[PDB]
Design a protein around this ligand. Structure first.
Ligand SMILES: [Mg+2]
Ligand SMILES: [Mg+2]
Ligand SMILES: [Mg+2]
Ligand SMILES: [Mg+2]
Lengths: 244, 246
């Protein structure tokens, strides 16, 4: 999919977003001031929809559910707490962008650019805890990535053999048989930081596990527990490095 | 300075380091197999020295202190590591260490020396209302060879930025009196884009979701407290590289 949908009645905000996404990404953008204007907009043609909660024909966020049910991923554009972040995210919204300033709005621009590029990117999560593994996988799937799953380094190695397009691996630190630092060592014996990006999952409650990952050639670290925003920052930056 | 010193008696390891650093950086290299070979070497000519602990004329790490005392910053080359060694080396004033147990671990030294060279001409700002954590972070950044400015509150940070427009990276403490970190980030981003001024938002991570708030407000990155020096170094290097390359 190559297009972005914007549903936002503010002329100023809609124009800011169109200009910025056009300049920075070159992606095709369809923008409407009402939910009704977007009635022909389908999941199969759009990467994501940036959706205002205050629409003239949907003034209390009704456009979110409508577009999600048509198969369009949704990012909410919002002016204003822990209860909203939760409720909308539980409803399956990918993310929210604050629209109280031009610079907060700019978050959406990098976001849609990343979502578009992620569609064709394969990543791998290696983690022996089903609970941590599935949480991370769900979060990466809301970044529109193709996500492979491994419960064990042995599985991860086999998955990499089978799927050479995988370009980023997230590696848990303690696992049966072959721990994370050992897996990083194995991978770096074969693959450079440009051929295969590795983010070591660590804890800052420790004798420098992050340092050990980096000294073995991991591109970066991410400390557990992490929030989706943190995961997105760290994954995006590493994917962007591979593209440059 | 644009030269590095390597003192390493392993023919294999020394040659791997020379080849990689020569191919992947702009640094001139002087490399010797004994501490004596480096007798002429002066702190003012070299960015950093990569120093083996097992040298023929310094078989138990003696070259570290000798070279530090000559004013050369020192990164240790080590085949193994423990928590006691890391602590001892950092107390002694070593910048960092490089594992030399494989070819791919040596690669760490290459990215490091390239970064240490570039950092000499880069100005950064630490904003933190506690002198203790502020000075610790400043000391860690000064061991990355950065030019480090300090500010004890948002008001001073702004004044400093006005007075020093070359500052390209700001590290921001959230909890400060009068104007908190996120408020400072909002002010900065009303004037400066992510490419004009990188910001790493520092937070304790709890129910307030501070990292996310920083990110949504335009910070380039986050770093949660407590953090280790290597974590700080990694984040700073990544943000500096993004400014140069993205
Ligand atoms: Mg509206
Ligand atoms: Mg585990
Ligand atoms: Mg030796
Ligand atoms: Mg404070």
């Amino acid at each position: 999919k190559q297009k972005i949908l914007i549903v936002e009645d503010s002329m100023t905000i809609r124009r800011m977003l169109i200009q910025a996404i056009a300049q920075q990404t070159g992606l095709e953008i369809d923008a409407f001031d009402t939910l009704e204007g977007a009635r022909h907009c389908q999941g199969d043609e759009y990467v994501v929809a940036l959706v205002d909660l205050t629409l003239p024909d949907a003034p209390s966020g009704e456009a979110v559910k409508v577009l999600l049910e048509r198969g369009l991923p949704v990012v909410i554009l919002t002016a204003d707490s822990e209860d909203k972040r939760e409720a909308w995210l539980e409803a399956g919204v990918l993310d929210y962008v604050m629209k109280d300033s031009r610079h907060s709005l700019q978050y959406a621009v990098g976001l849609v650019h990343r979502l578009y590029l992620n569609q064709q990117i394969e990543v791998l999560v290696v983690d022996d805890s089903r609970t941590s593994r599935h949480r991370t996988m769900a979060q990466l799937r809301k970044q529109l990535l193709q996500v492979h799953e491994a419960s064990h380094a042995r599985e991860a190695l086999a998955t990499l053999e089978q799927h050479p397009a995988i370009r980023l691996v997230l590696v848990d630190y303690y696992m049966p048989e072959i721990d994370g630092i050992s897996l990083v060592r194995m991978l770096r014996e074969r693959y450079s930081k440009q051929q295969l990006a590795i983010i070591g999952i660590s804890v800052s409650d420790k004798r420098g596990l992050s340092a050990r990952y980096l000294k073995q050639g991991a591109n970066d670290f991410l400390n557990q527990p992490f929030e989706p925003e943190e995961l997105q920052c760290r994954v995006s930056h590493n994917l962007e490095a591979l593209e440059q």
